[PDB]
Amino acid sequence: EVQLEESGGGWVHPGGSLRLSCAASGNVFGVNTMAWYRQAPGKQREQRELVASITDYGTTEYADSVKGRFTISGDNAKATVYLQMNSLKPEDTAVYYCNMDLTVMTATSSLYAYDYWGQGTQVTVS
Amino acid sequence: LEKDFLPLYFGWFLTKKSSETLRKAGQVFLEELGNHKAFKKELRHFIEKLELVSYFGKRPPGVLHCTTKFCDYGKAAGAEEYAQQEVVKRSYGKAFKLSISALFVTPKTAGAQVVLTDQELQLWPSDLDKPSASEGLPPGSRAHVTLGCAADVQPVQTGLDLLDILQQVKGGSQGEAVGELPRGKLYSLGKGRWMLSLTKKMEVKAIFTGYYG
What we know:
The complex is a heterodimer. Chain A has strands at 2-6, 10-12, 18-26, 28-39, 49-55, 60-62, 70-75, 80-85, 94-105, 111-117, 121-125. Chain A is mainly β. Chain A has a single domain (2-117), classed as Immunoglobulin-like. Chain A starts with a strand and ends with a strand. The relative contact order of chain B is 0.24. Chain B is built from seven helices and eight strands; from the N terminus they run βαααβααββαβαβββ. In chain B, strand 7 and strand 8 (193-211) form a beta hairpin. Chain B: Substrate binds at residues 67, 146. Chain B: GO terms for molecular function: 2',3'-cyclic-nucleotide 3'-phosphodiesterase activity; RNA binding. Chain B: It comes from Mus musculus (Mouse).
């Protein structure tokens, strides 16, 4: 029973920066992966594209469209992820959803790996 | 234990804090080894500036752990017997303390050596301790926590590289401390192996349970 809670987001003129964060509340045993997907105005949710990923080890994967402009951070101890976005372009306008592959302990102490999604954070560039 | 529905494997899984104490400790180690004069000498025995961190950043994402029995939901040989054991049933969800006696890295894996206690060995299986060097190494020497892996390296490799490291460490062929790191004494064992004998045993909190993935 975890809850993903986003923050950040807003309206920015091309060439600004926001820091999208996303904590995880509940009974999380450990973090396996944390990523950021985004859905542009018009899209349906079926077209949520990967924006940035981070592993427990710290290995990051980015999309060429954002690689060098965005920078994903992390903190496995607090189950928090960050996406400091730099030099924003109008094409970056979207809702940025927070994904997290996490290990969770059931009542019998067993462990399972779950995939949680966040509500979303609005990002506008104009 | 779920006497029927078996996990992918049993083992000791580190809590969120212990996991980062060990995880971050393993990074600084790789940061020191890669910048240490000894390691830089024998680099051609290990492969630009080869940053060991990225080199070993292929471990399957997941919580750090010391595996005991791989079960594959009972398809693995011996799984059913292990889970049906009374000690295994009476320890599910019980918290144990795992002692990390040294860090190590090889061209294939980068892990941490686990020195199981007498009771922890009650849960150690008797099949994961007879590869090639386990003959003459004591039971439970393969016990480890994988911190990193090279490109095409399955985490099972980390346990075998440890037995390879220990086999030489026993033979007195580790040589002399090629240096003193802040955490302990660095030792060059040749053929790419390295060991940071920890002056102080790192203590990590861990829960014995099953992982279903």
